[model samples]
Target chain A: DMKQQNFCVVELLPSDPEYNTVASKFNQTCSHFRIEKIERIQNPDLWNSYQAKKKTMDAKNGQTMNEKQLFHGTDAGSVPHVNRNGFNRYGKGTYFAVNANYSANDTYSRPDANGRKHVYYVRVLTGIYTHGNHSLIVPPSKNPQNPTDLYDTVTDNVHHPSLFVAFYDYQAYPEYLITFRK
Target chain B: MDMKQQNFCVVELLPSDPEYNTVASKFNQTCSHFRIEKIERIQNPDLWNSYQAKKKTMDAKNGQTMNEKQLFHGTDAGSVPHVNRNGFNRKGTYFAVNANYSANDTYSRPDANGRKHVYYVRVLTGIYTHGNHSLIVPPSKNPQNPTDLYDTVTDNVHHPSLFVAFYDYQAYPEYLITFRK
Candidate 1:
């Protein structure tokens, strides 16, 4: 939550009703707009090749890798100046990936000029299944015929909330107020 | 985010205090347990082409043009499970990447996947930078200044770190860390 006392921006969340509900609903809006494009390749040769690389990597990692073709998420938000590869289908955008190699944690303890802890996260919009037309998509599905089939009519299309709660500095803010807006 | 709550194994977070303390501690522990190993990539120029083809199809909807050589993160992550190009440096470990992508945000209006509300976070680790080393063997004399200069030293090293953090959510979790072991 934006600390009310810090007063970086002025907004009112008063506790008393005595003040006139002088209220025009003070709608505070922030625009997070982006565009990301993806195409599911139907080419057999290319799909086969990706499968091979995926398999090789899986073998090394001790994972019996599945032979599924992967999709790409544009790395736009990466550069602050331009917003590329950021998509918002069904009124949503992209989550930029964060790198978690810092000194603060037990594994490594180096800090940078920003001094703010390296709070990183990765975009979950990977592969065709994530981007399909279904309203909700679950991690595992026994039958998916195509893009539409990939989505869960029960989950993605109808009643899933876009929620992200990341725990960072407890001292700075007691709790994080996570939300998404158009 | 506890592994017990999701689809991944090999990693777990305590449920009682599962959101922040649990997730953070799990990431911290995972970082310590991480190690680098060398693996050979089978020379497959043909697969590179396949990756390119996939890229074209996905990006076509957004009306962006791309070259065949452009590298993609998802493709790379999918194929090279053990080798993460974005990994931080630690002595013996060659590379590592956050194997999972989190989708969901915890905002006011609660939904199923919970992907659109809160912040997304992940751990970034690996060897990304190359070390420096000298080419020549011995010392040399600076004849112009009448002074001797040494060119005998060589160096090989990389600084690695443990990468982690969170960001405002939109469509996915953003990358927030890069570190060395």
Candidate 2:
């Protein structure tokens, strides 16, 4: 279906006062931040697998899915919450995600036309605030110049930073994605 | 020297009264968007009584409604007697040390001797009027505002200065401060 295009682009007209006001606030707060745009990954197989793994982790830790619990799995019926997300608690980081796996440990499987793994993407904003003195896990190549494919095996190293995604399946649940990791 | 001991009085500016409405409008014009809902007043028996007695005498001599300019002027140590000997003479005005958080309610009791009732006023910033700035309130005890009056007073009970005497409250019934005709 046309509605399942996975990613949709938004356009903002500068002439609009309300839009300009919002853009002004965002620019004031996010100008110095770096942005990382992640490509789409198929859902159901990929997203559901990640959700299962996240739930098991939470259960093992005796963490219940509720408002009081900061981090919970996607399928747990909790309000959409993403915890830690592999970034320092107080660090230069903010982001948005869509049509993607919301939790770390969700396995992305092969996709087919009729029933396939869901596709998702994320845009991460960084550097708005100073990050603590912790080593950042850079992409495997450590060189964006190499331009490695996102799905390449080299990108799947176990030691690599994991992003946990939790989807709150509500009004816009299927249309939006939220990610987090601890 | 006694006149130099800045004193204050309690006057409730109600929304319904014509005179109070005029004062509120004047304040809004002067202080830039001054809201009446957040204002409060503290009542001290000693200060209120002394100020009332003085105002009664002033009204008897100069007629009703004291002049504003004559009330705020200041002078040196040796000035005319009864003319604010310590220089400052602002009727219905006083200054307290930054007692925002100390010497508020806990230090004073409801029935304790010399205890006072603390009042409050709400202030909004960034309002411009005639290129000058002024400080500028509401009604009842625990008037459902962002601030809790009793809590604010208790929070400022440890300090000492121009506004002294501990304060306490029992009945919180709302009342208006009407001017006598």
Candidate 3:
């Protein structure tokens, strides 16, 4: 019973022309930074395991008959939902999705097609904006390489850096369990 | 300074199906392609001047004067809304409130404030999707040179790349403008 589980909630703006490009690009930049940071702390061997699991899930067998069978063990759902089940306390404006999983000590597991274990720790993400778009993936500079730089510099013509709050389980092994961790 | 502009519409979709994902990516891919194209061709002085002139009249001194003296610009009463006008067609939807100008060009002149010259362009844009999300910006394959490679990948996984449809303006003073030459 000491095992604990956590959840990841993300909010994003669409990638449309008006304002979505900035929002979407900002989201990617953050996820990439997270991945870079994760690589710094975790065992590189876990990368292989993660990729293998991802491949298995990407290839789904429709022939499977069991309704209870969970092919892709990671539990992730998306939509405009007000988390009445206490998953959301931020008073849901428009979060991306909610993902529930085991914490560091907890065992949130489901069998893969080959009956192998797939475990994922939860993380938290937020979508905030400044005056215009900011690429989260690339490090901030005048010559950053993210595509967002083009739009951020050209289309939006903005330069102010905004801030967003990202939450994650501190007790997790990977230290960071989401996208590019830098 | 203080002028009104029109808002563009964006496309949205659910990425549950492979076909849908494919289409969404295609839409963004096309727009990105056109963006590159537009940037390359919008570099002619004459065309830029004409474009700027169009913008000047649209950004004229007083909205109230232009409305009152609609036919005083040395043209017939119904000489057509050439050079500057208040309405534009967005697809089949026409809007008089939404302003469309030659903002994609650079020219000179003064507003009520002062003489101001700056690089500016108008983008036809809209929402690709809604709700919680992530996104891939310029999907890349290379590790060292990839653009936010890891971040885009994560967005690819977490948020399905959303798609939008928009018609961008062509710059560079093409054959259409050359016909009068």
Q: Is the docking of candidate 3 incorrect, acceptable, medium or high quality?
A: incorrect
Residue B87 of model 2 has an lDDT of 16
Give the share of true interchain contacts found in each model. 0.00, 0.00, 0.00
lDDT of 1 by residue, A1-182 (tens): 11111101011223323111211111111113111111111223323333454444445435332222111112112111011111212212222211221111322212222221222122221222222232322333435554323321111222332222111111011010111111
Return the DockQ of model 1.
0.02
**Segments of candidate 2 deviating more than 4 angstroms:** A1-182, B1-23, B32-37, B60-181
Give the range of the ten consecutive residues with the poorest summed lDDT in model 3 chain B: B172-181
TM-score of each: 0.17, 0.17, 0.13
Model 3, B39-81: lDDT tens per residue?
1011234334444554454346324332110000111111111
**DockQ of candidate 3?**
0.01
Expressed as tens digits, the lDDT of each residue in A156-178 for candidate 3 is: 21243222212111111222222
- Scored by CA lDDT, what does every candidate get? 0.22, 0.24, 0.22
Model 2 per-residue lDDT tens digits across residues A67-158:
11111123211111111021112112222222123322233312222222222222221111111222322222323775452111111112
Instruction: Report how far off residue B16 is in candidate 3 (Å).
Output: 15
